Design a protein around this ligand. Structure first.
Ligand SMILES: CN1CCC[C@@H](Nc2nc3cc[nH]c3c(=O)n2C)C1
Length: 106
């Protein structure tokens, strides 16, 4: 499917970005105790990859929602001057640029 091919490319490019390291896998309780009592809807790029392979992203408004949740979770949990917050904004920019290059639209 062409939609699948585009999203996989976009996601793979996001996963390769230098600023994607805080979001590759789910937050661990060891890394942030009590995280999962504040962030009701966790999301990460591994979870997104599996969701892509399982064919859950039948639309753009969907792939966007999951990836945006990653950023909003980080901005809600962390302060603006932490490296996690900084990484979210850098990666968000890159993401939106990649969305434009592909002309991905609803
Ligand atoms: C799998 N692990 C590897 C290590 C980094 C972790 N991601 C992460 N950790 C902390 C700690 C405080 N705030 C955050 C945060 O916002 N994030 C996204 C994911």
């Amino acid at each position: 499917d062409q939609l699948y091919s585009t999203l996989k490319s976009i996601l793979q490019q996001v996963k390769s970005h230098q600023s994607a390291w805080p979001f590759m896998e789910p937050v661990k309780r060891t890394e942030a105790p009590g995280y999962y009592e504040v962030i009701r809807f966790p999301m990460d790029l591994k979870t997104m990859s599996e969701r892509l392979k399982n064919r859950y992203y039948v639309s753009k408004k969907l792939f966007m929602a999951d990836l945006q949740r990653v950023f909003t979770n980080c901005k809600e949990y962390n302060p603006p001057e932490s490296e996690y917050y900084k990484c979210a904004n850098i990666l968000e920019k890159f993401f939106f640029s990649k969305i434009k290059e592909a002309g991905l639209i609803d």
